[PDB]
Amino acid sequence: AKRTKKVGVVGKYGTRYGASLRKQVKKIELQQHAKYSCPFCGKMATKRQAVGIWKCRGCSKVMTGGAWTLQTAAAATVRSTVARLRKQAG
Amino acid sequence: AKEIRDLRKFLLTARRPDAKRVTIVRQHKSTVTKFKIRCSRYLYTFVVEDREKAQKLEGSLPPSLEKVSIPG
Amino acid sequence: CKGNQFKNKRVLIEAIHNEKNLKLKEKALQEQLEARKSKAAAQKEKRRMKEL
Amino acid sequence: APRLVYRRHNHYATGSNRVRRVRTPGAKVVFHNVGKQPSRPKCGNCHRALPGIPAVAPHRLRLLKKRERTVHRAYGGSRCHACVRERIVRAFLVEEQKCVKQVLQVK
Amino acid sequence: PVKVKFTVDCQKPVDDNIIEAKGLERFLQTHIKVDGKCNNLGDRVQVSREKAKVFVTAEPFSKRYIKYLTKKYLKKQMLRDFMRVVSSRDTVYELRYFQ
RNA sequence: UUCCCGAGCCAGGACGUGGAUACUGUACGGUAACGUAAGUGAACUCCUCGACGCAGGCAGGUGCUCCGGGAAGCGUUGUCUUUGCUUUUUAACAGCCACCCUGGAAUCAGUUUAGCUGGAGAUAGGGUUAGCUGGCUGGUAGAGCACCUUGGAAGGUGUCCGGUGCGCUCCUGACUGCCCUUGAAAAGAGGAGGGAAAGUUGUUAUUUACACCCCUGGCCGUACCAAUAACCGCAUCAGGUCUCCAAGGUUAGUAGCCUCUGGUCGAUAGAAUAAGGUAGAUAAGGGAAGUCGGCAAAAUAGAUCCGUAACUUCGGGAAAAGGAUUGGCUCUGAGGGCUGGAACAGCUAACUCAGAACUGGAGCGGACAAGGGGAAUCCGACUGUUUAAUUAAAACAAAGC
RNA sequence: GUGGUAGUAGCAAAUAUUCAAAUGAGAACUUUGAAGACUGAAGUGGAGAAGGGUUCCAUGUGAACAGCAAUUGGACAUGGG
């Protein structure tokens, strides 16, 4: 069975805090409790040890990342642009 | 504390000159017996089951060694 | 078993006997088709050697 | 029925004052202060526990014979062994790649 | 199965004339239960005396159960204060006095 | 835990006899994980232990509690009772009982209560290692315990063999989850990398924890109370004051009620039973008409089965509301484990549900325990906080903005 | 310093005592027995800390103190630990 209609992971927080605030939490709480793919081994076993720290369970390696996802999109843009700036300098 | 398991070692530990006494225990079940040499660090002890071997063994202990003690 | 399905030990044992005794009646059917599709080639190859 | 009293100076429920109910030749039930459970040597950089070498509190590692505190290998006392293979396969190859250049640097 | 022959001598009593040792034989014939049965003595149980001292023979039985039944007897004769049952050995009781 | 008897251990420092190892230079064995009676290692450097959160269940262990057999003594006995109760114990210390090799996985397989694990090498077969408060022997029966007989304190027997569990206690172990919370340091002990030194077949030299042997361990606290009488409240004051251990029955239960071990009867007494008090019960008919106001007290209450609205931030409301059943006794059915190889044959252990018959002054959550409910308005969103001794709120805080 | 108030208010929470014998000048109250109760293992039980400081233990006793009594005592005195 699916055992709630909508609220999902945030049935936890019950009948309080207000539904707009509760939804903001739902979408990024869904991110952080996810497993992500490891860069280094491949296996999708990465968990968030602490805000800004992620550990690949199978691999044993730890790496830095976002608060609530492995790769923040701003940081993905910098990895693109610094690879470009290195190439044109030669 | 410690045990001995054979007659090679028990003859050495008796003859060793800091061994004080040999208390000898006997108990009915049949007549299983214990020798115990109080040496200086440890109380060594040697279980024998047959009485006729143990009677022979008490002769093999030295006379110049001091004590012997028995229950009964 | 981990789902729910079987409530006693007896129902699991009764389930294993039902689902094994299919595969005996399967292997009666499967062995003859493996024999006959071999004998489809074996009747052919005895004929096709006798061509030359 | 029978209920007991702490024997040592510390009458509180800390780590150090861990205790173990025994009964005696008296038929009398009584504590013994067994200490904290020793962590056995997790050793780097893997941080796996080492086979061969027992959990003791670290002053009692003195009592043991030297044999017992190690493993007879290279880096045996503090290494994973598996980790050790890494050390050799590095130091073999990183010398060989460094050597192959320095013969090619004669030209 | 094996067999055990016990005893209860009444000798220090009877020579004062206070116990009748005939009475205790016929008491134990009646009152002993076998398989939760009374007066159903056959082949397991065999009760028979010198008269100086009574014997009881059994097949699963308990040394205790004889001391239970002799305490039952001594209450009916009003002799509890005078004597008590005591183990002389394994396979034996003796009757005694208080001091 | 300080005295005595017995059995050990540790720190510092060490003679001696007898073993190992080397003498053109520090032991060997195993494929390995690592091993054994020993098996040198200066300067300097790196590492480990010391060294760490909370919640959750799961498995294993100590102690407790429990059931049965055996042996002692004890109790009850007008009646019945192979019966009911007590004892049946074993210390620290000391010895022994995740990772590697072969191999190469999809018709994916292994596996937990729960998820996880696997070509960065799974299942399987064979090893190595970690461990607890596990088992056996020593310690150790000489002690302790329970009984019996002679003295007027001497001498004896016995102390045996098994179960059970979502049980209670503390501990360990590996897991799972939680955080804009990620959960001390230093003394001290040890390992490794390094190779400085010494040692030429004998008074040598490394072993001071290789085995045994030898010597020394200062200073101070240590009585007793720890509270309805040893503390603080002016007092032998119904007040206050941190920690540990924690039995049986009933029950979900460390709730309430009764009990065993241990503890206590300390609180000025005797006689009468007026009014008025203090606390506690009960009242025909009516049922808030009392009162500022249902204030006080009644009524409801457990468990099982059925049933459950407006409204809603869809999570709730909800134990909504509204009903039926429950005792005793006698039965029936369903639910495990271990042995020898279509599933059979033997031995056997739990308290948990479902249903039926009978029976009773229609009682049965029989004492104890245990929500009154519903319809609306105002304020504050919520949990949280506050005027120690007249104000707990609508006040403070709060996340969000 | 002393009255009247006045032999008055009052000594009523924590379920509870009773019978015998011994001791003594004297017993509702001390001790010993026999009964009957309570506490009911998050105990009024067994051990520590803070605080107290000899209250601990024994023998003895003329007062006062222990809101009645007292042969008892954390009181008083002499010893010991």
- The string of DSSP codes covering D13-50 is -SSTT--EEEE-TTS-EEEE---PPPPP-EETTTTEEP
**Strand G positions within 7 A of protein Cβ atoms:** 41, 45-49
How many Å does it take to go from CA D78 to C1' F42?
22
Q: Which two tokens stand for residue E38?
A: 């009374």
Cβ atoms E85, E65 nearer than 8 A: no
Measured CA to CA, the distance from residue B13 to residue D94 in angstroms comes to 61
Sign of CA dihedral D83, D84, D87, D93: negative
**Cβ of D11 near strand G (distance < 7 A):** yes
Measured CA to CA, the distance from residue E26 to residue E23 in angstroms comes to 5
**Cβ of D99 near strand G (distance < 7 A):** no
How many Å does it take to go from CA D78 to C1' F3?
49
Sign of CA dihedral E46, E47, E51, E55: positive
Measured CA to CA, the distance from residue D31 to residue C18 in angstroms comes to 60
Residue whose entry in the numeric block shows the structure tokens 């992971």: A9
Measured CA to CA, the distance from residue E23 to residue E27 in angstroms comes to 6
Cβ atoms A25, A10 nearer than 8 A: yes
How many Å does it take to go from CA D16 to C1' F234?
44
Cβ atoms D16, D36 nearer than 8 A: yes
**Cβ of D5 near strand G (distance < 7 A):** yes
How many Å does it take to go from CA A13 to C1' F383?
12
**Cβ of D29 near strand G (distance < 7 A):** no
Cβ atoms B30, B12 nearer than 8 A: no
How many Å does it take to go from CA C5 to C1' F5?
71
Task: Please report the resolution in angstroms.
Answer: 3.2
Helix (H, G, I), strand (E, B) or coil at B28: coil
Concatenating the DSSP letter of every residue in A13-77 gives TTT-S-HHHHHHHHHHHHHHTS-B--SSS--S-EEEEETTEEEETTT--EEE--SSSSS-HHHHH
Q: Which residue is nearest to nucleotide F17 (CA to C1')?
A: B16
**Strand F positions within 7 A of protein Cβ atoms:** 1, 6-11, 27-30, 32-41, 46-52, 62-65, 69-79, 81-83, 87-95, 98-100, 112-114, 116-118, 120, 128-133, 137-145, 147-149, 156, 158, 170-173, 177-182, 188-193, 209-210, 212-214, 221, 243-247, 260-261, 313-316, 334-337, 342-343, 381-382, 399-400
Helix or strand run (H / E) with residue B55 = helix B51-60
Helix (H, G, I), strand (E, B) or coil at E30: helix
Q: How was this entry determined?
A: cryo-EM
Measured CA to CA, the distance from residue D1 to residue E27 in angstroms comes to 43
**Cβ of D6 near strand G (distance < 7 A):** yes
**Cβ of D4 near strand G (distance < 7 A):** yes
DSSP state of B3: B
CB neighbour list of residue E29: distance below 8 Å, 6 or more residues apart: E39, E41, E47
Q: Which two tokens stand for residue D39?
A: 């962590």
How many Å does it take to go from CA E45 to C1' G17?
56
Measured CA to CA, the distance from residue B55 to residue D61 in angstroms comes to 46
How many Å does it take to go from CA A21 to C1' F387?
36
How many Å does it take to go from CA C16 to C1' F305?
36
CB atoms within 10 A of CB B20: 12
CB neighbour list of residue A8: distance below 8 Å, 6 or more residues apart: A26, A30
How many Å does it take to go from CA B42 to C1' F4?
21
